[PDB]
Short mmCIF file of C-alpha atoms and ligand atoms in Angstrom, two decimals:
data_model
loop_
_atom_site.label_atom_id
_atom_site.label_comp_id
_atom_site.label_asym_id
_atom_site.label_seq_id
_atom_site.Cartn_x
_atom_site.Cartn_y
_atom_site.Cartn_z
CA UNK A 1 119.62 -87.51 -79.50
CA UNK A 2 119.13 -84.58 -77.48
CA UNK A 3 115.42 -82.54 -77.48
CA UNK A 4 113.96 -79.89 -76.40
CA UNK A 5 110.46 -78.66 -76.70
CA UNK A 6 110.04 -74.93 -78.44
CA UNK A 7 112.13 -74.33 -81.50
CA UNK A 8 112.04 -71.35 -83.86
CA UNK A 9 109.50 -70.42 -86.50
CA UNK A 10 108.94 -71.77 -89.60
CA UNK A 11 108.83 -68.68 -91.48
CA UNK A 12 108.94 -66.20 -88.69
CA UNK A 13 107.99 -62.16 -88.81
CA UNK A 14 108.85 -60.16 -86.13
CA UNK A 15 107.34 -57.07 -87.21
CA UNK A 16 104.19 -58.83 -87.89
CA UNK A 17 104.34 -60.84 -84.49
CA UNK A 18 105.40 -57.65 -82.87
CA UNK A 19 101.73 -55.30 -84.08
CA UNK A 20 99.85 -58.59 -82.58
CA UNK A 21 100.84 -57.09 -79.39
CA UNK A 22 99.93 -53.32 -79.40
CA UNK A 23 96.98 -54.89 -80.22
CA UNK A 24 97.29 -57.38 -77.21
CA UNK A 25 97.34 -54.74 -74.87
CA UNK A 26 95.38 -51.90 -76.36
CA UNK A 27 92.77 -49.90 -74.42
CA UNK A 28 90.89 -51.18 -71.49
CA UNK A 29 91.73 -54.74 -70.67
CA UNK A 30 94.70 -57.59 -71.86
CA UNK A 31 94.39 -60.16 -74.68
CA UNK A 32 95.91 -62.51 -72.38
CA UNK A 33 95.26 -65.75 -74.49
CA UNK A 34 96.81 -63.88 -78.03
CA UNK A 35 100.08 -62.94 -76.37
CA UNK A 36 100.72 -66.59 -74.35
CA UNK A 37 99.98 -68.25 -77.83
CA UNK A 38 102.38 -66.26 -79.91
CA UNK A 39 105.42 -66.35 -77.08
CA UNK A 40 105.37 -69.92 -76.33
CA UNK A 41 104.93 -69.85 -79.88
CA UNK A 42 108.57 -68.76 -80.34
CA UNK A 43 111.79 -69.10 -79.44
CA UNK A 44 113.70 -67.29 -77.29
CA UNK A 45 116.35 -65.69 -79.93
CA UNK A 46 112.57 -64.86 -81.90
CA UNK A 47 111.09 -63.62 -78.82
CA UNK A 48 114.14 -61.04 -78.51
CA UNK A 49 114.05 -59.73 -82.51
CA UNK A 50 110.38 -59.07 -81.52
CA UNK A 51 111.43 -57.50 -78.75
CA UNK A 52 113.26 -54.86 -80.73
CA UNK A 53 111.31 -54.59 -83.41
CA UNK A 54 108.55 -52.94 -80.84
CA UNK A 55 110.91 -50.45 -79.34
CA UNK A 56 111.93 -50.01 -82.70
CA UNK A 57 107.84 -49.51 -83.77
CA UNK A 58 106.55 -48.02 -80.94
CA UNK A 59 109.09 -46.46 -79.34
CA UNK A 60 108.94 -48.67 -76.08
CA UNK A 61 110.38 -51.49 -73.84
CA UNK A 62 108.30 -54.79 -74.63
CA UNK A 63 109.18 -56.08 -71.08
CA UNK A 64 108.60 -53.23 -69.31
CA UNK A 65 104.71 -52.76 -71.00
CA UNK A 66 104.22 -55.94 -70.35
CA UNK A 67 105.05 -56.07 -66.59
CA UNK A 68 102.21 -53.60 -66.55
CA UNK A 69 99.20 -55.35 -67.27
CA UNK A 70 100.07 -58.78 -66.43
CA UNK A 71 100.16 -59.75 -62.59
CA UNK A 72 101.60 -62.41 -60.54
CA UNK A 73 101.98 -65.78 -62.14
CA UNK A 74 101.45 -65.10 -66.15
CA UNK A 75 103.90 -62.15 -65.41
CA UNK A 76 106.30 -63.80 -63.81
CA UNK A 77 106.25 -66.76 -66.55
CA UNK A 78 105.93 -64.20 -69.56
CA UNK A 79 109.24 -62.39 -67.60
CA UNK A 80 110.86 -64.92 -67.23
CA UNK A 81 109.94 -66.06 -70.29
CA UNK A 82 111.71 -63.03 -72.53
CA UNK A 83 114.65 -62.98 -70.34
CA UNK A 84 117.91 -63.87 -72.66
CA UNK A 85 118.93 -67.48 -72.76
CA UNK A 86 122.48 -66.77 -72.17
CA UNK A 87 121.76 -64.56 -68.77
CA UNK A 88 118.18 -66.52 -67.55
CA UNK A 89 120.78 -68.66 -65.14
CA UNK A 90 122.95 -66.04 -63.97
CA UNK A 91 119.77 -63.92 -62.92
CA UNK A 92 117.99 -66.20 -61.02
CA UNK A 93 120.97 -66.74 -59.23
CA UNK A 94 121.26 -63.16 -58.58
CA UNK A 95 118.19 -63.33 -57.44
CA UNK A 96 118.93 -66.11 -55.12
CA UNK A 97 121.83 -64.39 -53.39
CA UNK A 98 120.28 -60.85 -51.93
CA UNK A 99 119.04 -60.50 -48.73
CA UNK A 100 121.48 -61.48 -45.07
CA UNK A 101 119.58 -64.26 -46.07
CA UNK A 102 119.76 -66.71 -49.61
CA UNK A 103 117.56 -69.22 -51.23
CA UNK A 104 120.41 -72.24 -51.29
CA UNK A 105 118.04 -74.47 -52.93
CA UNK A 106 118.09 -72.36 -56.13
CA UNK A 107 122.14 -72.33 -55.82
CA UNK A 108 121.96 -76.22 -55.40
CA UNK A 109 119.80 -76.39 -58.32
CA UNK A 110 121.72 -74.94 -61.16
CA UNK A 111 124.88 -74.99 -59.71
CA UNK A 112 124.97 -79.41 -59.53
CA UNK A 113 122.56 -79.04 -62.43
CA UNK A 114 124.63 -77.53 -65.27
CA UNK A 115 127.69 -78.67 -67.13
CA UNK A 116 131.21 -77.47 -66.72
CA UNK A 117 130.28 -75.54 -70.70
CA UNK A 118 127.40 -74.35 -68.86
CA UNK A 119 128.88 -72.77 -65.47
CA UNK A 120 131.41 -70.92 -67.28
CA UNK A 121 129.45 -69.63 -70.20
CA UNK A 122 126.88 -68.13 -66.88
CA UNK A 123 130.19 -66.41 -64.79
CA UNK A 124 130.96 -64.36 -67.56
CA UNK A 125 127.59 -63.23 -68.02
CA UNK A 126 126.65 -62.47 -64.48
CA UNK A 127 130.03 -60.67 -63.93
CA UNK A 128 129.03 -58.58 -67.14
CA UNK A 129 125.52 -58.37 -66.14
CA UNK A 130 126.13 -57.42 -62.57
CA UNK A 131 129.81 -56.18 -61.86
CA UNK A 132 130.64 -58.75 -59.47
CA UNK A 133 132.37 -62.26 -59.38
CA UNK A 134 129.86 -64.67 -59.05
CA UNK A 135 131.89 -67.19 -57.04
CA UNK A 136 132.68 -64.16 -54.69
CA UNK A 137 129.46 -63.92 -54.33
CA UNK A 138 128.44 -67.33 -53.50
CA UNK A 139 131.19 -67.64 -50.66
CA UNK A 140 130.03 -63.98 -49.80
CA UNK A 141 126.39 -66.02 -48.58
CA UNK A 142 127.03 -69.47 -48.22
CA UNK A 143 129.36 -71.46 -45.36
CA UNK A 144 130.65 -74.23 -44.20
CA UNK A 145 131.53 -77.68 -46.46
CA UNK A 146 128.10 -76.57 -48.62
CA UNK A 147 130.02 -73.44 -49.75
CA UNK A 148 133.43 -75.16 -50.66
CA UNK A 149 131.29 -77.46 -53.13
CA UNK A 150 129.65 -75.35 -54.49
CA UNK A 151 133.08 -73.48 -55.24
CA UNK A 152 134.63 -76.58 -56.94
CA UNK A 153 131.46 -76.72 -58.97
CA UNK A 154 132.09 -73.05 -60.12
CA UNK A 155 135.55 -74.53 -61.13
CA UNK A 156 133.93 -76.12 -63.82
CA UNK A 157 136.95 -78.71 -63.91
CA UNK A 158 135.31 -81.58 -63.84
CA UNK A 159 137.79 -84.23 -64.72
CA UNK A 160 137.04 -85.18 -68.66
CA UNK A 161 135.13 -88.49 -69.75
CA UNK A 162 138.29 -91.00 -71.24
CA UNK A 163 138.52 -94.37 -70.74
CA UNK A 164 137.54 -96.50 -67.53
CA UNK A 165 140.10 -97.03 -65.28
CA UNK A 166 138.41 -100.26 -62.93
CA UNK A 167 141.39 -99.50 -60.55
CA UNK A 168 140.66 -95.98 -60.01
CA UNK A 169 137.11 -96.77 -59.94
CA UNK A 170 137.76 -99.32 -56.96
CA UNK A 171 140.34 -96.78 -55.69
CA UNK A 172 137.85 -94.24 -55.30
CA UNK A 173 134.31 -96.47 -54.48
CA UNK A 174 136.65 -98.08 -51.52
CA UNK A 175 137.62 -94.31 -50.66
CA UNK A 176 134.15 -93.25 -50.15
CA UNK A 177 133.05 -96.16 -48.48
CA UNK A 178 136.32 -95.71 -45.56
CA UNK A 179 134.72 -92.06 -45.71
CA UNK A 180 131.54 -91.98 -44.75
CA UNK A 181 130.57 -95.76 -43.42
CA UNK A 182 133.38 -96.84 -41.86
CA UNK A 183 134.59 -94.08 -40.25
CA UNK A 184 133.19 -92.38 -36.83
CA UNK A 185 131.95 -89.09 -38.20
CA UNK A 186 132.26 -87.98 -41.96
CA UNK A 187 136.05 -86.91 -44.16
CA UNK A 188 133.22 -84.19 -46.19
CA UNK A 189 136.63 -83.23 -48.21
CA UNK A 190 136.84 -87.00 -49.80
CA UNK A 191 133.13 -86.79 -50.93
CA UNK A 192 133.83 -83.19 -52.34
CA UNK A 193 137.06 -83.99 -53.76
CA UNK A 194 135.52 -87.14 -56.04
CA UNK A 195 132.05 -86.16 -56.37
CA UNK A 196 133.09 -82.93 -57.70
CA UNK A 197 136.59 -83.49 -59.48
CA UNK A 198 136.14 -86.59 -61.52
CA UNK A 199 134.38 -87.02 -64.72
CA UNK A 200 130.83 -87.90 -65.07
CA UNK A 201 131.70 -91.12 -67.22
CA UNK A 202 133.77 -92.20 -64.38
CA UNK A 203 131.99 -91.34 -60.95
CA UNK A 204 128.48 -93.31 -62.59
CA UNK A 205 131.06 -96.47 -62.14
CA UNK A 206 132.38 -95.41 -58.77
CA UNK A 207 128.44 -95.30 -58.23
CA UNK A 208 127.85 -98.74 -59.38
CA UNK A 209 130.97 -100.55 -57.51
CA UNK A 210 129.95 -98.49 -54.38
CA UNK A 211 126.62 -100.36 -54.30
CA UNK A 212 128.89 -104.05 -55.32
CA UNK A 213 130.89 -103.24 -51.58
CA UNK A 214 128.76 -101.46 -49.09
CA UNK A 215 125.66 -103.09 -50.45
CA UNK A 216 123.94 -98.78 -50.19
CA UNK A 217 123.19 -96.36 -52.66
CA UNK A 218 126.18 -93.53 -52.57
CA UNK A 219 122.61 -91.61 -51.83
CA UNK A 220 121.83 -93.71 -49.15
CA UNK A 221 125.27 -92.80 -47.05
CA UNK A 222 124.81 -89.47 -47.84
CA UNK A 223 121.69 -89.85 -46.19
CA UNK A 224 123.18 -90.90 -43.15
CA UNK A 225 126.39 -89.79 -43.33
CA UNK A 226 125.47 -85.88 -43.85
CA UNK A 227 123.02 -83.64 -43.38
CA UNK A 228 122.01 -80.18 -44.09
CA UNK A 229 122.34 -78.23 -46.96
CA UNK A 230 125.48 -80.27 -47.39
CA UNK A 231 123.08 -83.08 -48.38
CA UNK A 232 120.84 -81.56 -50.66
CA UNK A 233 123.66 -80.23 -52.48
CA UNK A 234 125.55 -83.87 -52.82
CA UNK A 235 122.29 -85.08 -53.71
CA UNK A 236 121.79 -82.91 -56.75
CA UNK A 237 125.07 -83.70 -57.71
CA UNK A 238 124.78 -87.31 -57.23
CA UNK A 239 121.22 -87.39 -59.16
CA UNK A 240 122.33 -84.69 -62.04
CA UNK A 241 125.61 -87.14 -62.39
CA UNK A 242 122.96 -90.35 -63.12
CA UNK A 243 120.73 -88.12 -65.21
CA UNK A 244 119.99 -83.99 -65.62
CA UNK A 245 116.82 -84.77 -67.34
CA UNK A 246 115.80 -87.17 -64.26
CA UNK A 247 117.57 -85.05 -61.49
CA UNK A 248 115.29 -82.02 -62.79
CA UNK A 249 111.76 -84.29 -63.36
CA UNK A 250 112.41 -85.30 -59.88
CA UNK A 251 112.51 -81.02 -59.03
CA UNK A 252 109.27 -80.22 -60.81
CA UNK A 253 107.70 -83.25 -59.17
CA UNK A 254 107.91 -81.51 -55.84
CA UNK A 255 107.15 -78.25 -56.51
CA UNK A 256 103.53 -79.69 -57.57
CA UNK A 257 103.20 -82.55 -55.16
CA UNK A 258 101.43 -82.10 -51.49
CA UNK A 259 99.11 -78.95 -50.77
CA UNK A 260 99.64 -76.20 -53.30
CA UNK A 261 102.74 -75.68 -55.47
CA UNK A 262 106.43 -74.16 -56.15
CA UNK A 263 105.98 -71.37 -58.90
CA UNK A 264 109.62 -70.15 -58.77
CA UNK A 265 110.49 -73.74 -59.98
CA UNK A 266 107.77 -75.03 -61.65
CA UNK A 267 108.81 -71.82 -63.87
CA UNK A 268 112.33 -71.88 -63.48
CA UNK A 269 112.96 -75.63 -64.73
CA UNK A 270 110.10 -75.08 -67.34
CA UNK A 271 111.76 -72.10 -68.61
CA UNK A 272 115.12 -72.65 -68.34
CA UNK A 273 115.35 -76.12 -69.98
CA UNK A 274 111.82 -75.58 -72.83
CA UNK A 275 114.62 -75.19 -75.87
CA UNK A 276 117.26 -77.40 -74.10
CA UNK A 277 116.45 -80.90 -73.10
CA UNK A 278 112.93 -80.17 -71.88
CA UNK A 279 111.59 -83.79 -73.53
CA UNK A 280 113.59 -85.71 -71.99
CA UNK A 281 113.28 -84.31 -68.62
CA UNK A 282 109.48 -85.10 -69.58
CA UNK A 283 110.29 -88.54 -69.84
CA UNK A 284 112.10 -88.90 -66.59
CA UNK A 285 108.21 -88.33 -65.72
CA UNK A 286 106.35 -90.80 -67.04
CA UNK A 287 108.49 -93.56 -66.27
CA UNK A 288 109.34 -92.16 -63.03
CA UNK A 289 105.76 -91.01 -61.53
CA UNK A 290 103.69 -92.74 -63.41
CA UNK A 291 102.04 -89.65 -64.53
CA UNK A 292 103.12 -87.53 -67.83
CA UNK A 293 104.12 -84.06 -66.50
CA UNK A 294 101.36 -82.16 -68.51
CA UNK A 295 99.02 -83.72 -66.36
CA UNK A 296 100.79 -83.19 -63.30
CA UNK A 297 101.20 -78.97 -64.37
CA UNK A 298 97.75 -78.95 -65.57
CA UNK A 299 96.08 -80.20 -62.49
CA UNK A 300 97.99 -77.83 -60.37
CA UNK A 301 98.12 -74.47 -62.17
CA UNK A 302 95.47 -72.64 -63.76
CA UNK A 303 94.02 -69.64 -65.96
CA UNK A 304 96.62 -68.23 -68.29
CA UNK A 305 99.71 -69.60 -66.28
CA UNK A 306 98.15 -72.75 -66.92
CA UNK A 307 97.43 -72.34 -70.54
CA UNK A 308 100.89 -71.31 -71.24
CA UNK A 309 103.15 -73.98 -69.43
CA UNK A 310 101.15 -76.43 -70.65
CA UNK A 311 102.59 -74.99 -73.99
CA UNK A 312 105.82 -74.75 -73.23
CA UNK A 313 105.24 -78.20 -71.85
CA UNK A 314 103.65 -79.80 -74.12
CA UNK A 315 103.08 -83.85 -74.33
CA UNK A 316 99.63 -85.10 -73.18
CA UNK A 317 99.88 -88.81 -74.08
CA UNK A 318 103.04 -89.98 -73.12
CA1 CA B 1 95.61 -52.46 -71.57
CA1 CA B 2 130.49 -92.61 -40.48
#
């Protein structure tokens, strides 16, 4: 298996859904409720037909309307919510990058979250979306050991998943454990070169035989071994490796937890995964927190915002 939460319509209309909208946002005021109900309602490749039949109706840019009477929150989820699947990624790492500044975190994210399929399929896109390299990019804000592993990510050349070679596996567990623990300092370049270059199916077994020999968690000398960004990035990695669906719960779980909450994320994952794998990531929340995650989003969100992630979201019992 392998679920997601919003699939397309069962007999869908997009010039129908498309008149529910002029309506939507006729005269004085916003129908705020009809337009969450019928977007969350569709998919995403749905959401764009609609999306032309308007302009092709009315003569106008859905997205662009749209921006105009909704404010903040909603608008950035119903944004963010029409943006193309293939380019979502690409632009909110766009976004991340501006500024003599950058919001790593967001780099981390995706970066150590997506497959070697999915990294590729998003550098073409930004480079046609932006005119730019994306990887020259990246380099062109980041530094230090961070960067360079985030580079070899881009390489999306992770070794593939054959079968299990125990040698290699106690070749490379005993490698990271001369690495990091027993050795004054830190060889970053070993961690980078193995976390990053060998296949998934493999490095889970490194993981395992690391914990046989040092008696730690590979997360655990990462802890003390590294530090900045560095760590949060080999973290990611680390956790996406053992599970995406449970790396990502464990990212929405944040953004909510503690005084206030993380929008950018809360929306990001939400959006970004709803057609993908979005279920399971849900159930890397339950069993992980001891709370479903509709809970969670509905007791720190509200109004509209709330209504509509807790669409997109979805499962109450759990
Ligand atoms: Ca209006
Ligand atoms: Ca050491």
């Amino acid at each position: 298996a392998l679920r997601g939460t919003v699939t397309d319509f069962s007999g869908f209309d997009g010039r129908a859904d498309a008149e529910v909208l002029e309506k939507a946002m006729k005269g004085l005021g916003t129908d705020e409720d009809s337009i969450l109900n019928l977007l969350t309602a569709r998919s995403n490749a749905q959401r764009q037909q609609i999306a032309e039949e308007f302009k092709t109706l009315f003569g106008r840019d859905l997205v662009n309307d749209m921006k105009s009477e909704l404010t903040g929150k909603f608008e950035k989820l119903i944004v963010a919510l029409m943006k193309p699947s293939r380019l979502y990624d690409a632009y909110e790492l766009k976004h991340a990058l501006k500024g003599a500044g950058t919001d790593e975190k967001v780099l981390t994210e995706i970066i150590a979250s997506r497959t070697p399929e999915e990294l590729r399929a998003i550098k073409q896109a930004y480079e046609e979306e932006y005119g730019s390299n994306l990887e020259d990019d990246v380099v062109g804000d980041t530094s230090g050991y961070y960067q360079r592993m985030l580079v070899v990510l881009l390489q999306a050349n992770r070794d593939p998943d054959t079968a299990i070679d125990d040698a290699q596996v106690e070749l490379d567990a005993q490698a990271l454990f001369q690495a990091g623990e027993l050795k004054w300092g830190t060889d970053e370049e070993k961690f980078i070169t193995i976390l990053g270059t060998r296949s998934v199916s493999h490095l889970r077994r490194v993981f395992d035989k690391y914990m046989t020999i040092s008696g730690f968690q590979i997360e655990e000398t990462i802890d003390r071994e590294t530090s900045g960004n560095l760590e949060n990035l080999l973290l990611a990695v680390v956790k996406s490796i053992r599970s995406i669906p449970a790396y990502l719960a464990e990212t929405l779980y944040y953004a909510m937890k503690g005084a206030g909450t993380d929008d950018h994320t809360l929306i990001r994952v939400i959006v970004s995964r709803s057609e993908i794998d979005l279920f399971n990531i849900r159930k890397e929340f339950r069993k992980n927190f001891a709370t479903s995650l509709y809970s969670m989003i509905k007791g720190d969100t509200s109004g509209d915002y709330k209504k509509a992630l807790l669409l997109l979201c979805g499962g109450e019992d759990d």
